[PDB]
Structures are given as C-alpha cells and as structure tokens.
RNA sequence: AGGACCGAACCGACUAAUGUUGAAAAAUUAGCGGAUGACUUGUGGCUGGGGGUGAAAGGCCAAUCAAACCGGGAGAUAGCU
RNA sequence: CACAGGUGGUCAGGUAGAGAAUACCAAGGCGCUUGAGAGAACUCGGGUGAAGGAACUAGGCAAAAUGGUGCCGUAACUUC
RNA sequence: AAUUCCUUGUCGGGUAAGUUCCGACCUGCACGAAUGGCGUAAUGAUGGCCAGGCUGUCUCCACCCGAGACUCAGUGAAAUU
RNA sequence: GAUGUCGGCUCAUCACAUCCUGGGGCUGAAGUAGGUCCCAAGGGUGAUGCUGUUCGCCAUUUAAAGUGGUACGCGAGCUGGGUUUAGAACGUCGUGAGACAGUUCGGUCCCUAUCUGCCGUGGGCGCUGGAGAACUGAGGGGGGCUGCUCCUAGUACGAGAGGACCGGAGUGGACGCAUCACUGGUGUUCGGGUUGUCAUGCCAAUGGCACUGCCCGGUAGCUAAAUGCGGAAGAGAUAAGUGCUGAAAGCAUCUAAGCACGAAACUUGCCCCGAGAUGAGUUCUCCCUGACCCUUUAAGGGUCCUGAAGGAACGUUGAAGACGACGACGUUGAUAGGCCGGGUGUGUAAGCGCAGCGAUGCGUUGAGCUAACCGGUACUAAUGAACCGUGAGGCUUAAC
C-alpha cells in the first residue's frame, strides 16, 4: 500500500502504566497532497505522485508551479512517487492524512543518514586496528595489506576502503507502530529512524511482515 | 614511487586542463560615486552601497 | 565531524584565542573602528557585543566582571559611561562587519568592523 | 559485564573467598557475562575448612556486577562489586547454603530458586 | 520542539517532592512478583540528580547487607511510586560522588537546617 | 673516612618513539648511569704508517683503517665485462 | 647553509625552595624571515575514559603507578 | 649445566591451562680443579622466571586539544625516466 | 648491473577433496544416536598456558573449531622473536689461525606514488531548441549463520532404561545497520574548589603562568559499553534421491513418448546504486513565433534590435562537507551573529551587614553566572546591477 512522507521531529519515550518506556520517534505527517496519478495506458505503471509541506512563493520556479496549477493545489516542499497496488484508487487533488496508518502496526521508515563524511576504515568498515605500541611505525590504524601479489597482481574492485560515510538513504524495517494522532498529525514509531532532526522521513506500511 | 616512464607533454596539458582561472566578470557600480568595486565590498574610495563609510 | 559546533579555533590554541580577542576588543572599544582578517571578525561579535551588554546596567559588580573580561579600567570606563548609554535602547547589533578586500602579504581578506554609532 | 580473567567475590558460604572467570560459556565468541549468566572458574583463594579447595575449577551464576542491571523502566541498579555464587559442575545447583548480600529480581528463573529463597533481599 | 515539549508535558507527575543531593529519600517502587504487585522501600542518600524534564533521573546509594548499592530512578516512570525525604543533608556539590570511596564515620553528612 | 650515598653543573650513553632527499653524512624528545674520582676540562708539547697508541674493539690515528693521506713507478696487470 | 649540533672562563637579583634542582618574576633580552583560512581520513605529540585488568606481545615494550619530610617499625642471609 | 644431541628425559613444585622457571635423579652425545673448580655477603642501564600494585598493552576502542595533511596567496626541489 | 627469509599482525580472495547447518539412498538403521556413500559453497567455522615458532600438547568453550591454492597470499601495509654479519662465552674439533643448520647473551627494517589496480569525490562534452523537477529499470552490489528452552509428547519406540519424526512458539550468541529517549564516556567552548608565584597603587575582588598547573562536576555535538531493527516467509526452475502411467524387450521397467516431486545451491522475493542503458528512455510543467545584408551557396556567415524559461556569480549560512559538490536563505527575509525569555550546568557571586579575638561561619541568596540547546525578535550582515543562457528547433518516409 502506499505511504506517507514526514519529517523527523525527534525522539522522546512513551511511558506505560505498567512500568515500560517505550522509545519513540515522532513524525510528524501533514497532509500529502496528491499532484499526479500515472497509469499503466500513459505511464507505463500505476503510482501518485504526492506533495506535501509549503514553500516560499518566491522559491517555486514557473515549471513548478505550472505543475502545480494543473493539480490545482499548494505548493509543497518536494515531490514523492509511491506505487500503487492493484486495489486501490487515488485522485488528482485529493489529501491523504495520518490515520491511513490507524491498523497498520508496523511500518517502513526510509531517510537519508546523517553524513560522516570521509570516514577511515576503522570506522567505515569496523577495521581492527593494529598494535599502539610493540614498535608499530606509524600504522595503528591503516588498513593493513590490500591484496595478495603477482598472482591476482590487482586490488579486487569493491575492497573495503576508506572513503564517504552516511549521507545516504537507509531504510528501517518493521517498525513498531506506538500511536496514530490524527488532530496532532504525528505518528509515534518504536525506536530510532535515519536521518537528523527536521528531516525528510518517507514512512511505509510494512513490506516484510 | 617514482615514474617509470617519462610522462609525455600532452598528460602535462591533460592535467593543466582545470589549471585555468576564472574571472570576476561582475563587477558592481556605487550608486552614489559611480566607482566599481567587487560585488559587497567597500569601493576603493571608501563608500559602500552609496554610503560614505571609511574617508 | 564538527555536527553544531561553534567558535572558530583560528589556528591557535585556547589561551591565545582568549588572548587576542581580549586584545582586539580593547582595541575596537577604544578606536571604535579596526581592520582584521574577516575570520577574526565574525569572531569578535560574539566577544565584544556581550560586554555592551553588560554595560548597559551599571553596578560595581558589572564593572568587575567587564574588568574580568577586559583587563584595562579605561576600556571599562568607556564601555560603562559611553558606549552602555549609546547603545541602551539597542537591542543587540551593535557592530557592523565591511569586506574591504585582499591584504598585500598573503591574500587574506580583510574586513572593517566599526560601533554602528561611530558619532554620526 | 565479566570476561576471561575477571576477578569476583564469593556470594555464599561454600569457602571461597575470590575465584576467576575462566569462561564466558553458552555461544561462541561470546564475551561478557551479566547477572544470571553462567561462567566456569577457577578458586584462586579459600577458607582452610570449606567445602572446595583452592585450584578447583566448577561453574557459578553471577549476581551482582558494578556494571548492574537495566530495568524496562529505563532505571538501572549497580552495586560495588561483582559476586557469584558456586554451582556444582553438573547439575548447576548451589554448593553453599547461606546467600550473602541483596541479590536482583534477574535471578527469577526457575533454575535460581535456591537463591531467591535463601537471600536477604531482592 | 513544541509538539514533543507538550508530548512531554501530558506525562510528567504532578506531586514530585522537592529535594537535593545529600537527602534521604525513601522510595516506594511496585514490584511484580506473579499476580501480585507490592511496594518495596529503597531509601539511601541522594547522590546525583539530573532534572531533564520528563527525563528526570535521580541517584539514590544504600548500604544493603554488608556492600553498597545504588539505584539510578526515572523520576516520572509509574514504576516509582512515591517520594518521601527523611532528613535533609548539607552538602556543597552537586554530585556526591566521593561518598563511594567512604564508609562509617568518614561517610556521614550533617543536617542541613 | 670512603675508586661511600642521593642529586644540579659537568661527563657519559641503557631504552622507547620520531626523524630516514633529516633541523643533523648518528641528532631531537622523554626517561637513564655516574657525579671527590681508575673524575672531568683548558693550553702547549710528544709518539707516524707494517708504524704509533690501545683497561682489547682488528678500536682509533682529521666524517678514511686486516694497514692513513698525497705524489711518482704507472697507460701495473685483468684468458674478464 | 642566517644549519634544532658543538664551543674554555667570569657574574649571579627577588619570592617560594636544602639547593647553581624547580615554579613565577627583576635587570635586561626576545616572539624563533612565509603567512591566511577550513577544521576530512591518516600521521605526530598530549589530555580523559564505562565494565574489565596483561586476557596484549617474542617479551608489561610502551603507558600507568610510586615519590617529600619528621616519626614508629622492619625479614632471610651476611664478608657484620 | 652460557655444556645433556636426543629432549619438550623423568619426577616434584608453581597455573585452570607450564618446550620457561625452580628443586631433584644421573641416564656428563660432549663438566672438572689457576686456557682454574666449587660456593658466596654486596653489587650490576646484566641474563631467565613468579607475585602484588598499576594501567587503553589488550577485550575494543570513543571523544577532546594542538602540529601537519586539505584549500588560498608568495616562493619553489628531489629520486627517476 | 639484487625476484628480502620464517612466524605473528592487519587485510584477504578463491577452489571443493563440505567441518557445521540443508536435501537423500543403504545399514549389522527400534528410539536416542550413529556409520557409510551421494548432492550441495548460501552463510558461519574459538580465545587462551608453553614454545620464536607453523605445528604440537594442554585447560576450557562451541552448532562447528574444514582442507588446500593464492611468490609455503600479504615487510613501496606493520613487526622482527627466530634464521643469517661484525662483540663475547660454553660444549666439541683442530698444533694453531679459526670452525660448528650444536648452544648462549647482546645486536641501524629507507621509500614525498608517475602509471595500472581499487575506495571516495568532482568537472567537460554528448544526449539534437533550451529549462525546472519527478521518474523508470536494463544491468551492478549487499544480506543470506546458528544455539537453547518449551509445546506437540513421555505420545511413537523399547522391554526397560532412555526417548522421536513431523509441526510450531519464545529468547539468546556472534554479525551488520540506523540512532542517541534512556544509561554511560569525552567534553582545553560552562561553572566551582585549590597550590606556588607575579601583577592590577593598595585592601578586598580579579587576571596571567606553572601539562586544561592540579582538580571536582558538566551543555550541545560525537560516541558505545546504551538502545531500536534486520537477514526472511513465499514462489519458479532444479541436484542427489523418489515416484506415476508405460513399450522396446506378452512379462517387467522412474524413461524411451508422456506426467509428477524434491535442498541454506540457482533465479527472484528484502535492501542499495543506477539511461555515458552512446542501446543516452518516460511523463507533467515553464519559456522564445523581429528585421536586414552578403555570398562559396549550406545543417552558411555576419549586422542591428533583442536575452526569455532558467542557470550561475556574489553574499548570510548549514546535525552537508578535504575541495568541489549538496541543502536553506537575500529584505516579498528568521539564513547566521547579537538580543530577549526560558532551559541547563555549576552550586548560595560581588558588595554590604551580622557573629566570633581571629581564621571562619551566617544572611541577602539556591544566589550569581552560564559553549554548541529550545522558543522568539530585523538590531547587524545577506544591495539595484551586471554576467551567462535567446528569438520557435534538421532531414526523409509513413500515417493523420
């Protein structure tokens, strides 16, 4: 089924009368406006293409806000695709809201991680490191040897290396959902997401199970 | 780490290909002095956005 | 990483940094204009606006602190008898920051900061 | 958390005074064990009349760790040392038969009965 | 932050006592021994306290049948049922955490008046 | 009193890292040993190459030692490259 | 080499300190002939660390630890 | 044994785990009495072993602080081919 | 006219003659267990005592502690204990100088990376008028392990001891990934104590320096030791193996026709990248429809007027980032600083009073201060320009 896109408010704990705390995420989910319907005649396959947010009317560029007259509806902060089922109908203009995920009880949550930037290998690739004393020269956290010798006589590409760490989109599954606030617009998930505070949060019933 | 060959003229001139520098292309005018001066910086005069400011 | 840190360290230990900016705000408190590398301003607000803002209420144990921060009694003097009643109904930005180009020995930009009172 | 070469004080009455952590069994690679987990020792010191002897090696539950217990509260309980008490090497029952010192609710298993009831608290 | 500010706000407790480091406080915590649920009493010297707002905790260290212990409470939690202060201590610090290496006489506190 | 003891100068040199086109053709930094003695240091002199001098290591003899350097024999010789 | 190396003697102020040790200063003399930014891996030289505690390694290498004075007390052995 | 190849001999001690150590036996391939034998107080920057303390040596690393590395302006090499 | 040796370390990759887990036939297979053979590489396959050691032997684990190849993989990655220089001694040998795959003690490991190879990160062009987005999926990668308990069930079996197949359920270990609610670490950028000394004329009160002088705490950020999640279920085609109908070869016979099954392999399914996928794709939207002249004439070139969508530059900046890049913002403004209010950390500031001979206490007073946190606020800085990018987009056929 389709999802929903948020943004990442941040992380509190849920207390239960019987002495548990829960660790939450709260998202908060305004309504995603529906800007595009693709079909299988037109486009080829069956998805919405969703909007949600507002933007400064001076940072919505004419081919955007073309796209967004003919849909008939505001403006958003970015555009999203989910693909459809075979059920399920949407229409151009129509407000998807939060209580879409009122049965759902696991959920997807897809964001971009936060960026490390050019991480080592002890880091990146959780490395070993070598010896701090024993008379190490100058190599208690390089990687070490890289190949074996003149019989590959390369390096075998995807080797573990240093390199750009996080900054990229992650997907958590089978999230525990805690609690669906329809007049407050957030959704309460179980456990820690991707990405920083005020971040784009793309949330999907479960696909697992 | 040294060559084994000598790299020819034309990596020399492959790799000088980013070298190149690039010009200012935008300079602004005071609306007050008439002088030119780099965009948000004082005028050589010592006036910024028609302003006196330094003398 | 460097995730919402603040405060440039200028290439420069701790002790220095204080140091210079205790130097350079006494400077700019008594000249009331001064050119620096745009770096060190931008780093001077956040050292030289507080102490007006400290200025603006006199007391004997405000003055002690300004002293404190700035050990010079002139600089105090002035800060507590001119620059806090110039600056009373100011809420905040007291400094301005002018790029003013490229200095002669090694190419750093230079910038004027000045009290955007300056008797005019 | 108890490791290889860990050293721990003796919770009953068996005669040990301190024993050393020889493994941390149940799984491979496994490093540390917490209250209620199941180590092999060696004694490393005794009372000159007790039940066990110096250079023994025999199993024993840990009950209390500095590195403590959390509790789904969020809350935690540390004590000030680390203790456990002497099992027989195959059927892990108790040697001793006086528990000293509170031990924690963890211990509620059905296989630490013993323990639970002969403790003074907790 | 406003939206978890009165997330937070609909789950504190309302009757938390005052009290500071040094304190005796007495605690009162539900403990579940099958189907039936009682009241244990924890009572020791406040050692620590982070007020955080719902994620308040406290640091309470007891000397319990020979070797010291110290429970580390989320206030806020129903967990923790009620909060007393025996005696009022008179400390400087914030956090009392010499008194770990001191036992007997060498560990008492004065009262605070 | 002491080829006493600790410990600065001073004289040495056990270990570690660093440096290795070095700041240096053997150093720097942190420790280390001795430190009234078989101690160290200044200024002169004296011993010469199959020779000196040596509490010994084939050590040292002007960043050169199973035989110094400079010039001659000498365009030594080389079934070898 | 305007080279982090070597180079005999003389003088020796104050406050702490047994001291020509060492901390901070006096007289004096300097900031070391490239600087300005960013604040990656990795390197170098430091600081701090939960539970553990030599399990590391060829090996406690390295780190950490001890330290001062008065006073009490001190083992085998001994060439006293 | 600075010697014993075999050999990690054997036995005892120390550890949970001991080709090391320490003490025995003699089964000295191949110790032996001034190219000294055997002990020995003290002493050694001597060699081998076991304790405690102590710790990032390690389990396993994590942060902070400087100096580089990165970038900019000035200057401007080398090995090598 | 030089291809560094062993072991450890860090990092590996592959083969299958598969150690574990999976499938199956035969048993001298009752069960529990096995044995032996066949198929099968998807993942996993100990850390310690001695020794320089590979090994070995131990003492305890484990689901299991596979075996080989890779210059006995790996020193322009590291170490250097061993072996293999120059000092010295011992046993032995030689008259001796010296020797000894006998022993012992001590004994300089340089390399600023051009090219390929690999991990990251960008430009230039093309993509056929340009632009803003959003897409698709053709291919690449990643993951792909297992214990224990309980129920079925003391049921089947045995004769009793003992004890299932087949089904499930819940919690672990190793391992990866996100994050920081909690719990901890660090926090020289926040407060407090305290030692020596030097200053602020002096007292008080402060600052400088002694490793942040030594310290006790601690905000944000980052972290792990903290905590959430996940390696599939299911398909399709199969391997070993098992069958159904069924002749050749009245019978038979899994195979020849024909019809079924069957494993952690395979291909998907879970996750990531991705049209330079030159084979450069797709949908929606935005913008430009003025002349003139010269000729080789051709998909030609200038000139004047015009410049649009958009983009860049510059500036305020960032839980983005070596640098580019990336994201928000420029007054139609919260993009940063300051400012206001709070929070938080430290713990009752200065000044004054009081008590005491004084040190000191006490009160005003939980007071003062408070980095990066939260919520605000135009006070300061985000300036009109300008710059780049155009003027309706080739040809041919076929449809309409």
């Given at each position: 089924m389709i999802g929903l896109v948020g943004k990442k408010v941040g992380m509190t704990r849920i207390f239960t009368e019987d002495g548990v705390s829960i660790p939450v995420t709260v998202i908060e989910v305004e309504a995603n406006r529906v800007t595009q319907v693709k079909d299988l005649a037109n486009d080829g396959y069956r998805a919405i293409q969703v909007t949600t947010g507002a933007k400064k009317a001076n940072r919505v560029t004419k081919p955007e806000a073309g796209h967004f007259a003919k849909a008939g509806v505001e403006a958003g902060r970015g555009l999203w695709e989910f693909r459809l089922a075979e059920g399920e109908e949407f229409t151009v203009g129509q407000s998807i809201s939060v209580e879409l995920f009122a049965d759902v009880k696991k959920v997807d949550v897809t964001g971009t991680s936060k960026g490390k930037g050019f991480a080592g290998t002890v880091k990146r690739w959780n490395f070993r490191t070598q010896?701090?004393?024993?008379?190490?020269?100058?190599?208690?956290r390089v990687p070490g040897s890289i190949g074996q010798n003149q019989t590959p006589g390369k390096v075998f590409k995807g080797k573990k290396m240093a390199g750009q760490m996080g900054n990229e989109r992650v997907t958590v599954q089978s999230l525990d959902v805690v609690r669906v606030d329809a007049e407050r617009n957030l959704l309460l998930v179980k456990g820690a997401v991707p990405g920083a505070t005020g971040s784009d949060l793309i949330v999907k019933p479960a696909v697992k199970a | 780490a040294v060559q084994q060959n000598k790299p020819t003229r034309s990596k020399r001139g492959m790799r000088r290909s980013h070298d190149a520098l690039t010009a200012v292309t935008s300079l602004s005018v005071d609306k007050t002095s008439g002088e030119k001066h780099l965009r948000h910086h004082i005028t050589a005069d010592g006036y910024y956005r028609g302003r006196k400011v330094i003398a | 990483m460097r995730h919402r840190k603040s405060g440039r360290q200028l290439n420069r230990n701790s002790s220095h940094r204080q140091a210079m900016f205790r130097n350079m705000a006494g400077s700019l408190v008594r000249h009331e204009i001064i050119k620096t590398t745009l770096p060190k301003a931008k780093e001077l607000r956040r050292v030289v606006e507080p102490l007006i803002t400290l200025a603006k209420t006199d007391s004997v144990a405000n003055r002690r602190l300004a002293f404190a921060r700035t050990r010079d009694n002139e600089i105090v003097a002035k800060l507590f008898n001119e620059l806090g009643p110039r600056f009373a109904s100011r809420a905040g930005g007291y400094t301005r920051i002018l790029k003013c180009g490229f200095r002669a020995g090694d190419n750093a930009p230079m910038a004027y900061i000045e009290l955007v009172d300056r008797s005019e | 958390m108890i490791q290889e070469q860990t050293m721990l004080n003796v919770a009953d009455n068996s005669g040990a005074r301190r024993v050393m952590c020889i493994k941390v069994l149940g799984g491979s690679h496994r490093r540390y064990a917490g209250v209620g987990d199941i180590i092999k020792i060696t004694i490393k010191e005794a009372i000159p009349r007790g039940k066990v002897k110096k250079g023994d090696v025999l199993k024993a539950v840990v009950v209390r760790t500095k590195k403590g217990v959390r509790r789904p509260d969020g809350s935690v309980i540390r004590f000030d040392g680390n203790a456990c008490v002497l099992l027989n090497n195959?059927?892990?029952?108790?040697?001793?038969?006086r528990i000293f010192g509170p031990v924690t609710r963890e211990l509620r298993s059905e296989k630490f009965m013993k323990i639970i009831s002969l403790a003074p608290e907790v | 932050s406003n939206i978890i500010k009165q997330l937070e706000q609909e789950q504190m407790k309302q009757d938390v006592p005052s009290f500071r480091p040094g304190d005796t406080v007495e605690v009162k915590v539900w403990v579940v021994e099958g189907s039936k649920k009682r009241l244990q009493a924890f009572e020791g010297?406040?050692?620590?306290?982070?007020?955080?707002?719902?994620h308040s905790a406290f640091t309470v260290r007891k000397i319990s049948n020979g070797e010291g212990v110290e429970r580390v409470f989320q206030t806020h939690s129903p967990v923790v049922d009620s909060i007393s202060v025996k005696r009022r201590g008179a400390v400087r610090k914030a956090k009392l955490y010499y008194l770990r290496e001191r036992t007997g006489k060498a560990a008492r506190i004065k009262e605070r008046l």
């Open positions: 010896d701090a004393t024993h008379g190490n020269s100058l190599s208690h | - | - | 195959n059927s892990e029952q108790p040697i001793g038969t | 010297v406040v050692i620590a306290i982070r007020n955080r707002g719902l």
